[PDB]
Protein backbone atom coordinates (compact mmCIF):
# COMPACT_ATOMS: atom_id res chain seq x y z
CA UNK A 1 0.00 0.00 0.00
CA UNK A 2 0.96 3.62 -0.64
CA UNK A 3 2.66 5.28 2.35
CA UNK A 4 -0.34 7.63 2.74
CA UNK A 5 -3.16 5.50 1.29
CA UNK A 6 -4.61 4.31 4.61
CA UNK A 7 -4.47 7.68 6.29
CA UNK A 8 -6.07 9.38 3.27
CA UNK A 9 -8.88 6.76 2.99
CA UNK A 10 -9.66 7.12 6.70
CA UNK A 11 -9.81 10.93 6.54
CA UNK A 12 -11.87 10.90 3.35
CA UNK A 13 -14.37 8.43 4.83
CA UNK A 14 -14.78 10.70 7.89
CA UNK A 15 -15.24 13.78 5.69
CA UNK A 16 -17.90 12.02 3.63
CA UNK A 17 -19.69 10.91 6.84
CA UNK A 18 -19.62 14.43 8.31
CA UNK A 19 -22.79 16.40 9.03
CA UNK A 20 -21.43 19.31 7.00
CA UNK A 21 -20.33 17.23 3.98
CA UNK A 22 -23.62 16.99 2.05
CA UNK A 23 -23.02 20.02 -0.29
CA UNK A 24 -19.58 18.66 -1.24
CA UNK A 25 -20.27 14.93 -1.87
CA UNK A 26 -20.58 15.35 -5.63
CA UNK A 27 -19.62 17.92 -8.25
CA UNK A 28 -21.76 21.00 -8.47
CA UNK A 29 -24.54 20.45 -10.99
CA UNK A 30 -24.30 23.03 -13.80
CA UNK A 31 -28.03 22.84 -14.54
CA UNK A 32 -28.82 23.76 -10.93
CA UNK A 33 -26.04 26.37 -10.72
CA UNK A 34 -25.59 27.60 -14.30
CA UNK A 35 -22.69 30.05 -13.77
CA UNK A 36 -20.68 27.98 -11.26
CA UNK A 37 -17.93 26.90 -13.70
CA UNK A 38 -17.67 30.42 -15.08
CA UNK A 39 -16.15 31.33 -11.75
CA UNK A 40 -14.64 28.18 -10.27
CA UNK A 41 -11.71 27.08 -12.45
CA UNK A 42 -10.37 24.24 -10.27
CA UNK A 43 -13.55 22.53 -9.11
CA UNK A 44 -13.33 19.78 -6.53
CA UNK A 45 -15.67 17.58 -4.47
CA UNK A 46 -15.39 14.50 -2.29
CA UNK A 47 -16.39 11.99 -5.00
CA UNK A 48 -13.60 13.35 -7.17
CA UNK A 49 -11.19 13.00 -4.24
CA UNK A 50 -12.34 9.40 -3.72
CA UNK A 51 -11.81 8.65 -7.42
CA UNK A 52 -8.35 10.26 -7.35
CA UNK A 53 -7.45 8.21 -4.26
CA UNK A 54 -8.58 4.93 -5.93
CA UNK A 55 -6.79 5.90 -9.18
CA UNK A 56 -3.44 6.30 -7.34
CA UNK A 57 -3.34 10.10 -7.71
CA UNK A 58 -2.40 10.85 -4.06
CA UNK A 59 1.29 9.94 -3.82
CA UNK A 60 1.93 13.03 -1.75
CA UNK A 61 -0.33 13.87 1.18
CA UNK A 62 0.08 17.50 -0.01
CA UNK A 63 -2.02 16.76 -3.11
CA UNK A 64 -4.92 15.47 -1.01
CA UNK A 65 -4.75 18.45 1.31
CA UNK A 66 -4.70 20.76 -1.72
CA UNK A 67 -7.85 19.15 -3.07
CA UNK A 68 -9.64 19.33 0.31
CA UNK A 69 -8.76 23.03 0.39
CA UNK A 70 -10.29 23.56 -3.09
CA UNK A 71 -13.56 22.22 -1.74
CA UNK A 72 -13.54 24.62 1.23
CA UNK A 73 -12.04 27.63 -0.57
CA UNK A 74 -14.00 27.31 -3.79
CA UNK A 75 -17.12 27.26 -1.61
CA UNK A 76 -16.23 30.45 0.26
CA UNK A 77 -15.19 32.07 -3.01
CA UNK A 78 -18.54 31.44 -4.78
CA UNK A 79 -21.03 31.73 -1.91
CA UNK A 80 -21.88 34.69 0.32
CA UNK A 81 -20.42 34.80 3.83
CA UNK A 82 -23.99 34.69 5.24
CA UNK A 83 -25.08 31.52 3.41
CA UNK A 84 -25.42 28.00 4.78
CA UNK A 85 -22.75 26.81 2.27
CA UNK A 86 -20.17 29.16 3.72
CA UNK A 87 -21.02 27.84 7.20
CA UNK A 88 -20.71 24.20 6.06
CA UNK A 89 -17.32 24.94 4.44
CA UNK A 90 -16.00 26.46 7.66
CA UNK A 91 -17.26 23.57 9.76
CA UNK A 92 -15.93 20.87 7.44
CA UNK A 93 -12.56 22.61 7.25
CA UNK A 94 -12.21 22.90 11.03
CA UNK A 95 -12.96 19.18 11.22
CA UNK A 96 -10.51 18.36 8.44
CA UNK A 97 -7.73 20.40 10.06
CA UNK A 98 -8.19 18.57 13.38
CA UNK A 99 -8.28 15.12 11.75
CA UNK A 100 -5.02 15.70 9.85
CA UNK A 101 -3.21 17.66 12.56
CA UNK A 102 -3.78 14.82 15.05
CA UNK A 103 -1.62 12.46 12.98
CA UNK A 104 1.91 13.46 14.01
CA UNK A 105 3.43 12.67 10.57
CA UNK A 106 1.17 15.28 8.90
CA UNK A 107 0.96 17.94 11.63
CA UNK A 108 3.52 20.09 9.74
CA UNK A 109 0.98 20.48 6.89
CA UNK A 110 -1.76 22.18 8.95
Amino acid sequence: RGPHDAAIQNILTELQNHAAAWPFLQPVNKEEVPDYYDFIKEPMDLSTMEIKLESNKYQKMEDFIYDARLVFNNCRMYNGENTSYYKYANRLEKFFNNKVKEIPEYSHLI
Partner: peptide, 5 residues
Protein backbone atom coordinates in the same frame (compact mmCIF):
# COMPACT_ATOMS: atom_id res chain seq x y z
CA UNK B 1 -30.63 27.53 -4.10
CA UNK B 2 -26.90 28.11 -4.50
CA UNK B 3 -25.99 31.29 -6.37
CA UNK B 4 -22.96 33.57 -6.83
CA UNK B 5 -22.42 36.06 -4.02
Amino acid sequence: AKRHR
